[PDB]
Amino acid sequence: DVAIENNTLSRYADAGNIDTKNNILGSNVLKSGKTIVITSITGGIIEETNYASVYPVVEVERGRVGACTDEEMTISQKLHDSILHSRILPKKALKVKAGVRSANEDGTFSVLYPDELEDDTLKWSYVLYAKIVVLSRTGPVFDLCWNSLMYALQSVKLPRAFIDERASETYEIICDQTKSVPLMINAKNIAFASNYGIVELDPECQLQNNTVLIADLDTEAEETSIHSTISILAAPSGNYKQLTLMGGGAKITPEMIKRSLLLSRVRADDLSTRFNI
Amino acid sequence: KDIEISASESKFILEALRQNYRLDGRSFDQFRDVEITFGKEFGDVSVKMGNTKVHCRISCQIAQPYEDRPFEGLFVISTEISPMAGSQFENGNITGEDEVLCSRIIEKSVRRSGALDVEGLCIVAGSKCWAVRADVHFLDCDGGFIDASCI
Amino acid sequence: DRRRLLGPAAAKPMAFEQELSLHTGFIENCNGSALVEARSLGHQTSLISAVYGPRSIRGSFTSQGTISIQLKNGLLEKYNTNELKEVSSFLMGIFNSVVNLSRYPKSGIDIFVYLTYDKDLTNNPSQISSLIPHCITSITLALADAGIELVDMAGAGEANGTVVSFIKNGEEIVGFWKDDGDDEDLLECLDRCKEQYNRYRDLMISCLMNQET
Amino acid sequence: AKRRFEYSKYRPLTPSSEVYSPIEKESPWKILMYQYNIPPEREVLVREL
Amino acid sequence: MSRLEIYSPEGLRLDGRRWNELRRFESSINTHPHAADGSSYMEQGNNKIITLVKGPKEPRLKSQMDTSKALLNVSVNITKFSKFERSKSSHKNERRVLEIQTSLVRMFEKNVMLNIYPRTVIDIEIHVLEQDGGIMGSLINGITLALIDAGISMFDYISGISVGLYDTTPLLDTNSLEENAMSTVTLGVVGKSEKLSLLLVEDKIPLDRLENVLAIGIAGAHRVRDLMDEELRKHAQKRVSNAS
Amino acid sequence: MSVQAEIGILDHVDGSSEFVSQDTKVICSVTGPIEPKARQELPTQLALEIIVRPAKGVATTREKVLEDKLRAVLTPLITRHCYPRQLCQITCQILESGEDEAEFSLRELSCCINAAFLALVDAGIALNSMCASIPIAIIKDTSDIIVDPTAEQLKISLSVHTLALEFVNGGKVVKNVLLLDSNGDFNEDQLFSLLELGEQKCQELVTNIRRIIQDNISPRLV
Amino acid sequence: SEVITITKRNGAFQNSSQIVTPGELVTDDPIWMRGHGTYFLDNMTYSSVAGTVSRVNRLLSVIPLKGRYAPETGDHVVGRIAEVGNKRWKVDIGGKQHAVLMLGSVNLPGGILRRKSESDELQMRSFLKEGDLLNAEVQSLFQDGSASLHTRSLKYGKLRNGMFCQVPSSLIVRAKNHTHNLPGNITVVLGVNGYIWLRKTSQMDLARDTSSWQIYSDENDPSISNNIRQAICRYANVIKALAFCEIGITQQRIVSAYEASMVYSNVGELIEKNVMESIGSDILTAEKMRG
Amino acid sequence: FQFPEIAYPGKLICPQYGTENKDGEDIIFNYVPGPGTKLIQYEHNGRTLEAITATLVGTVRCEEEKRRTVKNILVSVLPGANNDFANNLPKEGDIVLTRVTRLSLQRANVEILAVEDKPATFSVSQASSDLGETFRGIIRSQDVRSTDRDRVKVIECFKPGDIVRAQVLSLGDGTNYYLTTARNDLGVVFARAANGAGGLMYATDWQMMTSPVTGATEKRKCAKP
Amino acid sequence: MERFSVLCNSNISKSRAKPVTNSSILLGKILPREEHDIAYSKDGLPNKVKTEDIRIRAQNFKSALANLED
Amino acid sequence: HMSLSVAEKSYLYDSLASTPSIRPDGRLPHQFRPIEIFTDFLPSSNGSSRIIASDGSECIVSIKSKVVDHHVENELLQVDVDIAGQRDDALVVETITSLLNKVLKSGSGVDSSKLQLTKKYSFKIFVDVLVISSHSHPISLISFAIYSALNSTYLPKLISAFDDLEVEELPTFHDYDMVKLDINPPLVFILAVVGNNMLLDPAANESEVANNGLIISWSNGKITSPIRSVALNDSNVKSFKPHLLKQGLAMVEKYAPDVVRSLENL
Incomplete structure (x- = not known):
């Protein structure tokens, strides 16, 4: 079962009272079973002189100090590669529409921005930094991190930027502490994660008065002994973003791939429904 | 990991050097012939000295120069060793005695010496500069790594 | 960086009634865990404490246990790493009196405290001091939940930047943290934090009874 | 060349090389008691022999 | 804003010295008795170096232990306040520094038999308090003095020197300005011999110059070696007088 | 499918190879079985140290994924229980991408799988079976399934695929699918048409591979 | 000041x-x-x-x-255990290498009565534990020069009922005996290695001038008067004073300094430089006009 | 009834000593600390005092264990799925399930997984097997079997990965515990053919282990059900 | 013991059996949440399971693994 | 740092925990050990000091200056702590670094007015600490050295006008001439708690057996923050009665001026 809490850690959590200190653009808390996932989205302003992605920093807590494990390295890249290849975030959606700030001599403070100019252009660009914390891990956790990141990306607000008259001394370019616009991403490309496994069990079963497949791998027992696995990122439109297959313990029949596609599609329907409500 | 050499080898090679002889049948002042092969792309070069095989790849990308040097571009040389050249080398061991020496020899021979015109790597002063990178790949080892790398 | 994905290095970051909620034993990855949420006025703090141990150290000849505490930034990057180490050193100076070390020879207890969030509202025409009593509350709960023997319940309070931790029903002190604020608040802060201690203590004891039940 | 011979029994065990003793003397009966694994009840007998 | 030259027609340099003058040398033994087995405080010009020799002693990890020879370690701490302009970052991991540390080790591995202290470790800690040219040569002299103070056996002295070259003639013992102005050669000299433990050239140097530059350095290093013997012997005489 | 490979090119390694498909050139080396580090030791099985080096720049998280997928293929191939408490170092140095590395890593992964297998063969390490990997892509308008696509074809692709199968019985029986890495979106009819034509060209490749192996190695034997 | x-x-x-x-x-x-x-x-x-x-x-x-x-064969040294491994301890002495001890080089509680046990080699930490101080004699020497120690005597063993201090080994030479009884009911143990142990005089020391189960107990004498404790502190300071002046420490020098230091009321006055220098200087001049 | 049934960590239960009046004679109740309790010192008004204090949150249970009478009461605290069980630690005489990590010629080292309780039930020691934090133990060649203690072929007794039920003679050093499979109920319990590559094998003879699946037979040291 | 009474008694009295109010601002509801499961029927619709029922699945397996020897 | 046996530690506790407390040395509960201080030996820096303890503990402090815009540079005094043969990252290093920076904040225990040059520019002070050797908590050792260094520091003198809002002249400094940095550096005292006794300047062996410890700052003739309780060791740490805390503050409050008086000599 999956239960989430979106926009709880963001600065845009409350409409009336906005956090002046918090720099989180979008957030998501997720817990599937025992494993808990906490995603926070931050940003940056970059000058610019087809689709892009975000830069995730996953921290899986196992209770050991030291550098980043090979797990955290691969996941950070796998999240970055999948988003980049699933075409979720276009480079045009990250374009910064700036503005101007003209100040009266204590008479007034004026800020002006134009919608029309940006459409004509159709130029600072936004960059989305992500950090994903994982608590209480119990198995393959890439899917959990992906789903939490997807829900977090569904709700991201990009604050507008502007500069008070300045000369190319030191000049500080600033964003607005209030005004912001919602991030526009392709919902048609939005996918969700799920894992599957293939194994054979010898043991006989008693009776009282041919391959088998397991969905959503958890527990050490399944992660350790099941060497034939399938990973899917599926979309509600029914377009599929990616597919991970590796058989190391048993043969992978085409009939099992089809079930996974059906299983993955069903998961996408379930996840999609949750987002709507 | 420490390589094992027989006492018999250590006595044989040492005695052979006193008789002006060596295993690969060379002289004392002789340098093994160097073979240079260029790839399809520019900056792709393969240097071979006997069994010693090294490969270098030159690349560059638009970057911004340091505040201290607004007229100079960026230039770095990478020589990370790998177990491919032999199991004697630890993967990513960039602090070992021989590794740091080799890294410093190349740097003082190319970087510090100003073999490359870093001033000509500047596009717009204090704003945009080219960043040339020299990546050396030690494919296999039969000695002479420093000589192979400089070439 | 070849370890993580820091993105473009030529870019720049963004430039612009006491209430308690206690929950323990919600993490199956460690031996003991705790969740502490406090909301006062416009200021609220939520942190998670994870305990791993006691686990045997090979070759260790120590006749007692060894405690290690580390604070982490869960979301908002506010507190300096240098300051996090300072509090950690302060926290370990407290629980080394609280934890019965004689029970775990040749062993070590690692304590991870994740400061996932703190929300600060400041009006316009120290800082980490207020979080300290909540960190002590979280750890003492996580240790007691883990099964680690504690000589007494550790608790604290924050009064005008002056933090002081109590055990044995406020009769003695296991930690003292004073930054800035004002002088001659010695007697006052000791009395105000003692009330916060007793309040935090009973809720901590009730917490274990509830979840344990 | 220096070392001097003396009867073994009188001297307390000595670290120094110069002192020489024909036999070690702490538990001569007992040393050999360990070897044949002789019980301490027979110990009195063993010492006499 | 200013400008400056190197060598004037009057035979004078930017600091006032002539072509062949050693800077002020002060040497100091047994400066940190309660911190190390051997210690030396070096003052060669404005250069200020603390050198500590800790050992031979038990290794902290049995994994790193040689049963045939002692383990020799050297760590150079170039402080952030060594120069006029304080460096923001630490210099410890810097590839330039790793090469220096490596270089120094290679030098003294052949100068101490290091066969008479098996299953031990010799740790050499160095702190550079102030820097003003020829820091490598000063590092060499500091280690040699400190090692001797520790009563650690070695075959001979190793004296370090700095060489500055302009036009036809090199300048002995270069400071930072001269080092900035012209290429320098750092020489490691063993005892009173002509044998070099360390030959270090990091900038461009005409090939004609080196033979003569080496000749100047070796002669100057001999003077430095003589001074060091005087420095320790003189101290001993002074210490004996103090005792009396 | 006009690939070209050489075996035993490195001197200071137990086994090595150089696989080339189109532009994509990868050189691989294998040392083992040898003494493992304590943190690498496996009580009963062989420990694999897998390293992937990029053609340009240093190894990043990208190559960390190439190492992971390459691990999924090589692990079940090797009879690991023959070497308990032992290590096998496997290093891949990609010499030429043969593709836009900023967008794809398809051809580099397949070439690494084929090269690693060849290096394992050269090193004389116990293998349960044989293996071959090919890159596949799908066109934007034509939607055709192109096996071994060029770099230019990848630019205009809708999906990219890495397929590595496990073969037994003289390279005629597909024991299992070691790795299938599909990025993009799919239709069922295209997939099986791809698998049918793909199996044919793979079988032709093994036959060619067998020829190459015999021709080079036979002069060495007696 | x-x-x-x-x-x-x-x-x-x-x-x-x-x-x-x-x-x-x-x-x-x-x-x-x-x-x-x-x-x-x-x-x-x-x-x-x-x-x-x-x-x-x-x-x-x-x-x-x-x-x-440098350890010579037959030296009386005092050392603190550094490590316990296998069937031996490595005891810090203050040399280039740690001291070596063999389970067969020590004496078990109950002694001669005691029977050999194979559990002793697994329970060495119950005898010598890291940090413990002890008397020991350099039994033998290894090839490199390392020392093998032994405590096969009542004279040697674990140290207690006192305080530790150390001086440069050059200031303590070999002698007929390094354990000495001093006024104030305290006893000094002057290890040749420079490691010194000052304790309350026990019966053993008294017997020389004229229970085998508790020879490894960490427990001290429950009845130690302040007059002995304040004597130890004074003896400690004067030893440090002799060491500060490069004066060779001998039993005669220590007692002489101890009585000469009585001029100063508070014991803490002996830590100051000018006091230490004068005390040592007074000893040298005293030996001048007495010699 | 005098002492609270359930005590949280830090709650006072009962003083050091106790006594009551019955049958015209004083009965002395001696309170001794146990699992979950810790005898500590508390002073009030300048007065020193020793009392039994619980260290774990649990219900409290007492049990008697051993002219003028004489008594001894054991005071302890029991918690009250997830199981931790730290108090449990390998001690001389206990039975322990282990797994073979490596084989040498003169001995066989393993790692401790679970420990048998006392009246079957076991106490599982949770630790990371890919780190080395797990307790390691060593089974000597002389401790393999009582039959022919001198010459024993270790290859024909144990095998890497095989599960071995043994009894610990002594703690040994920090590295290795001492393990003996001399008796009948001790030996290889669970094992597979070819170091775990084949099928499951079962114990028939004490010195022979067979597999009723592939018909494979490997020589092991088997125990008795 | 009487000293115990005055101090012990005083200590016992102080707590006052004060009432406790339960709330979670954000994290508390979601983190301590026990494990849950759902099943997708042929309709494709998710289906919930009773908490008691889920446990029953656990206790039934334990009896079928222990007692039901073959 | 120091390693002691169980027997030695108990004896030390008996010696020091006694009602008439006796130092193993013989000191009184307020007596410091003799120290030596050298100043003005680094000409390259604006100020410098070197403190040597009786146990060989040695610390070197350097003071360097830099002109900064105080509108963008919040902290005008940065303390940096280091130890050769020691990693920078270590818990002890960062804690002391964080602590010292609070002790010498711009608007807490330091007259930052004396660092101001113009309306827009001020002097940033870099206090670099190098601990060569130490056998106990070096916080008080470093504090004495920083004090001595800051009281012998000389900064460049300004020439140009001090109104950047209007005329906006580039900051120029007259050659040769310099102005002594008039400032009041705070001191950091460390105490040891053994039983019910409080000791000033805890020795190595004393700290090992101590039940607890206190870090108390001192400025302008009064107690000031940061005030921190600290575990000198980790094997014998116990809670302490509040009266001990008040005793410690009182103890510092009466013996600090004596220390400052012996330290204020130019």
């Missing part, structure tokens, strides 16, 4: 028979046998260290001015 004595100095980092120099030649007589501190090439004999030339018979050597203490 009522609370703290702070000596200050400005503009300076710090304050203040043939001659021997490096590269120096000692002799050119090839008949000589070259010893420590020297090295040779044909007829020439050179010095390897800074020190004084020593000629004993035909053996030419150079005695260094400084260096590590």
Whole structure:
């Protein structure tokens, strides 16, 4: 079962009272079973002189100090590669529409921005930094991190930027502490994660008065002994973003791939429904 | 990991050097012939000295120069060793005695010496500069790594 | 960086009634865990404490246990790493009196405290001091939940930047943290934090009874 | 060349090389008691022999 | 804003010295008795170096232990306040520094038999308090003095020197300005011999110059070696007088 | 499918190879079985140290994924229980991408799988079976399934695929699918048409591979 | 200087028979046998260290001015256990290497009555534990020069009922005995290695001048008077004072300094430099006019 | 009834000593600390005092264990799925399930997984097997079997990965515990053919282990059900 | 013991059996949440399971693994 | 740092925990050990000091200056702590670094007015600490050295006008001439708690057996923050009665001026 809490850690959590200190653009808390996932989205302003992605920093807590494990390295890249290849975030959606700030001599403070100019252009660009914390891990956790990141990306607000008259001394370019616009991403490309496994069990079963497949791998027992696995990122439109297959313990029949596609599609329907409500 | 050499080898090679002889049948002042092969792309070069095989790849990308040097571009040389050249080398061991020496020899021979015109790597002063990178790949080892790398 | 994905290095970051909620034993990855949420006025703090141990150290000849505490930034990057180490050193100076070390020879207890969030509202025409009593509350709960023997319940309070931790029903002190604020608040802060201690203590004891039940 | 011979029994065990003793003397009966694994009840007998 | 030259027609340099003058040398033994087995405080010009020799002693990890020879370690701490302009970052991991540390080790591995202290470790800690040219040569002299103070056996002295070259003639013992102005050669000299433990050239140097530059350095290093013997012997005489 | 490979090119390694498909050139080396580090030791099985080096720049998280997928293929191939408490170092140095590395890593992964297998063969390490990997892509308008696509074809692709199968019985029986890495979106009819034509060209490749192996190695034997 | 004595100095980092120099030649007589501190090439004999030339018979050597203490066979040393491994301890003595001990080189509680057990080698930590101090005699020497210790005596064993302090090993020489009884009912143990143990005088010491189950107990004497404790502190300070003046520590020197230090009311007055220097100076001059 | 049934960590239960009046004679109740309790020192008004204090949150249970009478009461605290069980630690005489990590010629080292309780039930020691934090133990060649203690072929007794039920003679050093499979109920319990590559094998003879699946037979040291 | 009474008694009295109010601002509801499961029927619609029922699945397996020897 | 046996530690506790407390040395509960201080030996820096303890503990402090815009540079005094042969990252290093920076904040225990040059520019002070050797908590050792260094520091003198809002002249400094940095550096005292006794300047062996410890700052003739309780060791740490805390503050409050008086000599 999956239960989430979106926009709880963001600065845009409350409409009336906005956090002046918090720099989180979008957030998501997720817990599937025992494993808990906490995603926070931050940003940056970059000058610019087809689709892009975000830069995730996953921290899986196992209770050991030291550098980043090979797990955290691969996941950070796998999240970055999948988003980049699933075409979720276009480079045009990250374009910064700036503005101007003209100040009266204590008479007034004026800020002006134009919608029309940006459409004509159709130029600072936004960059989305992500950090994903994982608590209480119990198995393959890439899917959990992906789903939490997807829900977090569904709700991201990009604050507008502007500069008070300045000369190319030191000049500080600033964003607005209030005004912001919602991030526009392709919902048609939005996918969700799920894992599957293939194994054979010898043991006989008693009776009282041919391959088998397991969905959503958890527990050490399944992660350790099941060497034939399938990973899917599926979309509600029914377009599929990616597919991970590796058989190391048993043969992978085409009939099992089809079930996974059906299983993955069903998961996408379930996840999609949750987002709507 | 420490390589094992027989006492018999250590006595044989040492005695052979006193008789002006060596295993690969060379002289004392002789340098093994160097073979240079260029790839399809520019900056792709393969240097071979006997069994010693090294490969270098030159690349560059638009970057911004340091505040201290607004007229100079960026230039770095990478020589990370790998177990491919032999199991004697630890993967990513960039602090070992021989590794740091080799890294410093190349740097003082190319970087510090100003073999490359870093001033000509500047596009717009204090704003945009080219960043040339020299990546050396030690494919296999039969000695002479420093000589192979400089070439 | 070849370890993580820091993105473009030529870019720049963004430039612009006491209430308690206690929950323990919600993490199956460690031996003991705790969740502490406090909301006062416009200021609220939520942190998670994870305990791993006691686990045997090979070759260790120590006749007692060894405690290690580390604070982490869960979301908002506010507190300096240098300051996090300072509090950690302060926290370990407290629980080394609280934890019965004689029970775990040749062993070590690692304590991870994740400061996932703190929300600060400041009006316009120290800082980490207020979080300290909540960190002590979280750890003492996580240790007691883990099964680690504690000589007494550790608790604290924050009064005008002056933090002081109590055990044995406020009769003695296991930690003292004073930054800035004002002088001659010695007697006052000791009395105000003692009330916060007793309040935090009973809720901590009730917490274990509830979840344990 | 220096070392001097003396009867073994009188001297307390000595670290120094110069002192020489024909036999070690702490538990001569007992040393050999360990070897044949002789019980301490027979110990009195063993010492006499 | 200013400008400056190197060598004037009057035979004078930017600091006032002539072509062949050693800077002020002060040497100091047994400066940190309660911190190390051997210690030396070096003052060669404005250069200020603390050198500590800790050992031979038990290794902290049995994994790193040689049963045939002692383990020799050297760590150079170039402080952030060594120069006029304080460096923001630490210099410890810097590839330039790793090469220096490596270089120094290679030098003294052949100068101490290091066969008479098996299953031990010799740790050499160095702190550079102030820097003003020829820091490598000063590092060499500091280690040699400190090692001797520790009563650690070695075959001979190793004296370090700095060489500055302009036009036809090199300048002995270069400071930072001269080092900035012209290429320098750092020489490691063993005892009173002509044998070099360390030959270090990091900038461009005409090939004609080196033979003569080496000749100047070796002669100057001999003077430095003589001074060091005087420095320790003189101290001993002074210490004996103090005792009396 | 006009690939070209050489075996035993490195001197200071137990086994090595150089696989080339189109532009994509990868050189691989294998040392083992040898003494493992304590943190690498496996009580009963062989420990694999897998390293992937990029053609340009240093190894990043990208190559960390190439190492992971390459691990999924090589692990079940090797009879690991023959070497308990032992290590096998496997290093891949990609010499030429043969593709836009900023967008794809398809051809580099397949070439690494084929090269690693060849290096394992050269090193004389116990293998349960044989293996071959090919890159596949799908066109934007034509939607055709192109096996071994060029770099230019990848630019205009809708999906990219890495397929590595496990073969037994003289390279005629597909024991299992070691790795299938599909990025993009799919239709069922295209997939099986791809698998049918793909199996044919793979079988032709093994036959060619067998020829190459015999021709080079036979002069060495007696 | 009522609370703290702070000596200050400005503009300076710090304050203040043939001659021997490096590269120096000692002799050119090839008949000589070259010893420590020297090295040779044909007829020439050179010095390897800074020190004084020593000629004993035909053996030419150079005695260094400084260096590590060296273990001679039969020395009475005091050491603190560094590590416990296998069937031995490695005990810090203060040399180049840790002291070596063999389970068969120590004496078990109950002794002769006691029977050999194979569980002793697995329970060595119940006898000697890291940090413990003890008396020991250098039984033998290893090839490199390391020492093998033994405590096969009532005289040797675990130390208690006192306090530890150390002086440079050069200030303590070999003697007939290193355990001494002093006024104030305290006993000193002057290890040749420079490690010194000051404790309350036990019955053992008294017997010499004229329970085997608790020879490894960490417990001290439950009844130790303040007068003994304040005596230990005083003996400690005067020993440090003798060490500060490079004065060789002997039993006569210690007691002499202890009684001479009685001039100063508070014991803490003995930690100041001028007090230490004068106390040592008074001892040398006392030996002058008495000699 | 005098002492609270359930005590949280830090709650006072009962003083050091106790006594009551019955049958015209004083009965002395001696309170001794147990699992979950810790005898500590508390002073009030300048007065020193020792009392039994619980260290774990649990219900409290007492049990008697051993002219003028004489008594001894054991005071302890029991918690009250997830199981931790730290108090449980390998001690001389206990039975322990282990797994073979490596085989040498003169001995066989393993790692401790679970420990048998006392009246079957076991106490599982949770630790990371890919780190080395797990307790390691060593089974000597002389401790393999009582039959022919001198010459024993270790290859024909144990095998890497095989599960071995043994009894610990002594703690040994920090590295290795001492393990003996001399008796009948001790030996290889669970094992597979070819170091775990084949199928499951079962114990028939004490010195022979067979597999009723592939018909494979490997020589092991088997125990008795 | 009487000293115990005055101090012990005083200590016992102080707590006052004060009432406790339960709330979670954000994290508390989601983190301590026990494990849950759902099943997708042929309709494709998710289906919930009773908490008691889920446990029953656990206790039934334990009896079928222990007692039901073959 | 120091390693002691169980027997030695108990004896030390008996010696020091006694009602008439006796130092193993023989000191009184307020007596410091003799120290030596050197100043003005680094000409390259604006100020410098070197403190030597009786146990060989040695610390070197350097003071360097830099002109900064105080409108963008919040902290005008940065303390940096280091130890050769020691990693920078270590818990002890960062804690002391964080602590010292609070002790010498711009608007807490330091007259930052004396660092101001113009309306827009001020002097940033870099206090670099180098601990060569130490056998106990070096916080008080470093504090004495920083004090001595800051009281012998000389900064460049400004020439140009001090109104950047209007005329906006580039900051220029007259050659040769310099102005002594008039400032009041705070001191950091460390205490040891053994039983019910409080000791000033805890020795190594004393700290090992101590039940607890206190870090109390001192400025302008009064107690000031940061005030921190600290575990000198980790094997014998116990809670302490509040009266001990008040005793410690009182103890510092009466013996500090004596220390400052012996330290204020130019």
